[PDB]
Amino acid sequence: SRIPVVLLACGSFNPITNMHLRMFEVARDHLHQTGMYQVIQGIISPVNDTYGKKDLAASHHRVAMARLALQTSDWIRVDPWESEQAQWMETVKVLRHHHSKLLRVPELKLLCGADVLKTFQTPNLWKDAHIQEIVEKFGLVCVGRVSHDPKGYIAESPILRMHQHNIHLAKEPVQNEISATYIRRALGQGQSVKYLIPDAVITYIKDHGLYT
Amino acid sequence: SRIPVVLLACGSFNPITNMHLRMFEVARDHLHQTGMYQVIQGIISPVNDTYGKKDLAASHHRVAMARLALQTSDWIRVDPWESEQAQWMETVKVLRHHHSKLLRVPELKLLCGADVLKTFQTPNLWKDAHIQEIVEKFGLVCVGRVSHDPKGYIAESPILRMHQHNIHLAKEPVQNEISATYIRRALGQGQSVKYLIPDAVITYIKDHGLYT
Amino acid sequence: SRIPVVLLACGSFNPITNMHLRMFEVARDHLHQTGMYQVIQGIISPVNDTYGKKDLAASHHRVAMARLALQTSDWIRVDPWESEQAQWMETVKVLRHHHSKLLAVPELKLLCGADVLKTFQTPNLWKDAHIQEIVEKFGLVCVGRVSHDPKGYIAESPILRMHQHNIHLAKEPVQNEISATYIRRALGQGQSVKYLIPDAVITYIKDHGLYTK
Amino acid sequence: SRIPVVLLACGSFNPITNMHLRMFEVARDHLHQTGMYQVIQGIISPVNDTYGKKDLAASHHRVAMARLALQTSDWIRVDPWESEQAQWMETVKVLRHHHSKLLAVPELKLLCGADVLKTFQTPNLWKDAHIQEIVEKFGLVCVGRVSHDPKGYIAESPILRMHQHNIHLAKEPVQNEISATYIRRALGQGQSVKYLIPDAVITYIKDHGLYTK
Ligand SMILES: NC(=O)c1ccc[n+]([C@@H]2O[C@H](COP(=O)(O)O)[C@@H](O)[C@H]2O)c1
Ligand SMILES: NC(=O)c1ccc[n+]([C@@H]2O[C@H](COP(=O)(O)O)[C@@H](O)[C@H]2O)c1
Ligand SMILES: NC(=O)c1ccc[n+]([C@@H]2O[C@H](COP(=O)(O)O)[C@@H](O)[C@H]2O)c1
Ligand SMILES: NC(=O)c1ccc[n+]([C@@H]2O[C@H](COP(=O)(O)O)[C@@H](O)[C@H]2O)c1
């Protein structure tokens, strides 16, 4: 039988966009395609407000937009836990938390774009022990992104190359490179972002005067 | 004051996708950005079933999906006229028809991707007289597409370069290259196309067993 | 053992670019990776000056630029036969010509971008009989292009689908999407196209004053 | 008249690619087009071997490959000073070094991809003081990269926004998106990278057996 899988996406979702959503669909089809897994749930987990040097919309807003974006999904949901904690938390700790919840078994895997594998290379950004735990205790499902060569990132990482069994590379045949940075800039200039992010999210943004 | 403009998109819409929809939004912002026009209406006109060597879903279905896709739009509508004619019609004739309807004045402009300008170069595909009428009597609003250099197409076309005043090039800052061919193949393989085309269109496709 | 293969690319080469050259390399690696072919030669065949609606530099120059571009290739050569004819010739006839020239005979395959498969769908552009002969008697090696879905083009064409075993799809992960149209526009404006097309080609264009506004 | 400008690119160049070289050309044309600058030189400065978590070919080799790649450039040269130091050096210090070497003094600007602007946002990666000095005292010329929105990076950074006049954004319409990571993987698998990186660089890699699995 198939191994039940839950996919967790940790990010800013400032705001959530059609690309972020498409990432889950592609990842699920890829896992199902292997014949060994049954994706049963997707979880969007917006980062806490204390994170970064950037000016993120308040977490309750990012969580609300994600929920709106996901109303039409029958398998992906937003979980505010991470954003409700007092402070930012390294991603492995969010994985640990959700793994436990599953117990109160399906495998919990981190879902990210190929761009994330490249960030693993950034000095001091991710503790080696954490990278190892992500691919050894949990799993990593990576969706392609223009300009990134995931197979090379893996081959060149002493840690990743030793845990390839837990790394799933899903190819994105579609050229959908929507940048949330671009979304925010366009919104700020009064330009349309319709068809780039969900309609309900656009309405929410207008209603709450976000990204002005 | 601003010149009222109506944008007409002639295509297969087999099925209509988020890229096709995004094309209108980008074109409108670009025209408004110039300061000289006020886009008042967008029209999607699905091609007639007698067109091509391809197997297109029946026109009533393509028209229905476009209408569903456009329910959330307050300015773009589908007009079945072209698809309801007995036979295929060169595009200039569809422009003429809609121009007349406007009379029962706003300028009517053809909306297309940069890829269309390249098709103007195909031997025997578009009558020179027709290309001329499109850019001289009406107008052409072109939205960028990867791999295409619209400025070069114009510069190299004896006809286009003489009517640059009626050609508006709108740059697509977003990497959204969704191919309807890809959409059909994925649907045929049972893969998700969610977030690539409107939810209501996906439901319609399933309900009517299209693209199997 | 392996089936010997010669790759033929028919196109404007106005001018030849690093992307046109890259296609040969990607196609060769792909065929070798299947383990059943051995590519022994590549042929660049510039189209006749009588062809199409667009303006082309003289074939004399396009053949020259291809020759210069290929000086550092040990397996690809330019063949001016097609452009030396009195008039344009349908691609199937160029394939036939080069096949006869080969006459244990290596297989001759047409090398093209995935966008060519789409053009097969254009009314009146290619004779069905020709499309069939091209895929059946010669074969196609298609290199992917942003925005095109070759697999779908194949599936939606009865002719291509029936002979899909003779259509080899290669994937070049690198964007490239360098269009010769862009190259010509840049040149006309006095901008650099270095590292987009071969240094030797730029020298020829400059020396002979080509592609000026 | 025009302000003389020298462009400095700091990076791995592991190995240098046609895309890295193309960035210099695109950046020069952009600055010239503003009508107020005249680019007089480009400098490729390979990073020190002590840098980062990834494995780099020896700087001896990266400097060599850059020199070979640049033999056909009449304005870009490789400068090994940075890689010859005992240890890695923050980019601002390399800029300071090259500025002193210039000492009517031409302006020295850091040439980079738009993705570098994003990295400025990484906690602990660049000192705010350094980011400020880089944009204020030297300047940045950023060449666009698929997936990145430089204008947004600038607007969302107080430091960059305040000195945005010293950040020059150039647009290369051509995809390219050739990553050195891909180049290294292809080489390791014995695939061709011809027309993606300079012929002279491929010869050196082959002669010295670099980038093997
Ligand atoms: N060391 C870590 O655990 C680590 C480092 C960088 C980013 N992250 C997470 O991945 C996402 C990165 O977001 P940005 O790329 O916008 O900074 C966030 O969810 C962030 O919390 C975790
Ligand atoms: N000569 C003409 O008027 C002409 C030629 C080719 C396509 N078209 C139109 O433009 C669109 C092209 O569709 P395809 O590219 O799928 O063939 C259709 O609406 C078609 O009717 C018009
Ligand atoms: N029916 C045919 O044989 C046929 C049709 C269209 C293009 N072609 C060839 O394709 C190549 C490129 O043509 P384009 O520049 O029109 O895309 C040329 O060699 C041209 O001769 C052949
Ligand atoms: N704080 C700094 O000066 C700083 C930080 C990160 C990268 N860099 C430089 O950027 C270039 C490329 O670095 P990456 O390979 O890490 O992207 C190198 O020259 C590196 O030294 C400088």
CSV table of N, CA and C and ligand atoms in Angstrom, one decimal, chain A residues 10-12 47 51 82 88-91 125-126, ligand 1:
chain,number,residue,atom,x,y,z
A,10,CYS,N,6.5,26.2,4.4
A,10,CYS,CA,6.8,27.3,5.3
A,10,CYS,C,7.3,28.4,4.4
A,11,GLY,N,6.7,29.6,4.6
A,11,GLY,CA,7.1,30.8,3.9
A,11,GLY,C,6.4,32.0,4.3
A,12,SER,N,6.7,33.2,3.7
A,12,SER,CA,6.2,34.5,4.0
A,12,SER,C,4.7,34.6,3.6
A,47,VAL,N,5.1,32.6,8.0
A,47,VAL,CA,6.1,32.9,8.9
A,47,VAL,C,5.7,33.9,10.0
A,51,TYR,N,10.2,37.6,12.0
A,51,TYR,CA,11.2,37.2,11.0
A,51,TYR,C,11.6,38.3,10.0
A,82,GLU,N,2.6,28.5,13.7
A,82,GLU,CA,3.9,29.1,13.6
A,82,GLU,C,3.8,30.6,13.7
A,88,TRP,N,9.9,34.0,15.8
A,88,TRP,CA,10.3,33.3,14.7
A,88,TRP,C,10.8,31.9,15.2
A,89,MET,N,10.8,30.9,14.3
A,89,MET,CA,11.3,29.6,14.7
A,89,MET,C,12.0,29.0,13.5
A,90,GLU,N,13.1,28.3,13.7
A,90,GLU,CA,13.8,27.7,12.5
A,90,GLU,C,12.7,26.7,12.0
A,91,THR,N,12.8,26.4,10.7
A,91,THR,CA,11.9,25.5,10.1
A,91,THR,C,11.8,24.1,10.6
A,125,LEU,N,23.1,30.4,7.3
A,125,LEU,CA,21.6,30.5,7.2
A,125,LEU,C,20.9,29.3,7.7
A,126,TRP,N,21.4,28.1,7.4
A,126,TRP,CA,20.7,26.9,7.9
A,126,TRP,C,21.8,26.1,8.6
E,1,LIG,N1,17.7,28.2,9.5
E,1,LIG,C1,16.4,28.1,9.2
E,1,LIG,O1,15.6,27.3,9.8
E,1,LIG,C2,15.8,28.9,8.1
E,1,LIG,C3,16.6,29.8,7.3
E,1,LIG,C4,16.1,30.6,6.3
E,1,LIG,C5,14.7,30.6,6.0
E,1,LIG,N2,13.9,29.7,6.8
E,1,LIG,C6,12.4,29.6,6.6
E,1,LIG,O2,12.1,29.4,5.1
E,1,LIG,C7,11.3,30.5,4.7
E,1,LIG,C8,12.2,31.5,4.0
E,1,LIG,O3,11.6,32.8,3.8
E,1,LIG,P1,12.4,33.9,3.0
E,1,LIG,O4,13.2,33.3,1.9
E,1,LIG,O5,11.4,35.0,2.6
E,1,LIG,O6,13.4,34.5,4.1
E,1,LIG,C9,10.6,31.1,6.0
E,1,LIG,O7,9.6,30.2,6.4
E,1,LIG,C10,11.8,31.0,7.0
E,1,LIG,O8,11.3,30.9,8.3
E,1,LIG,C11,14.4,28.9,7.8
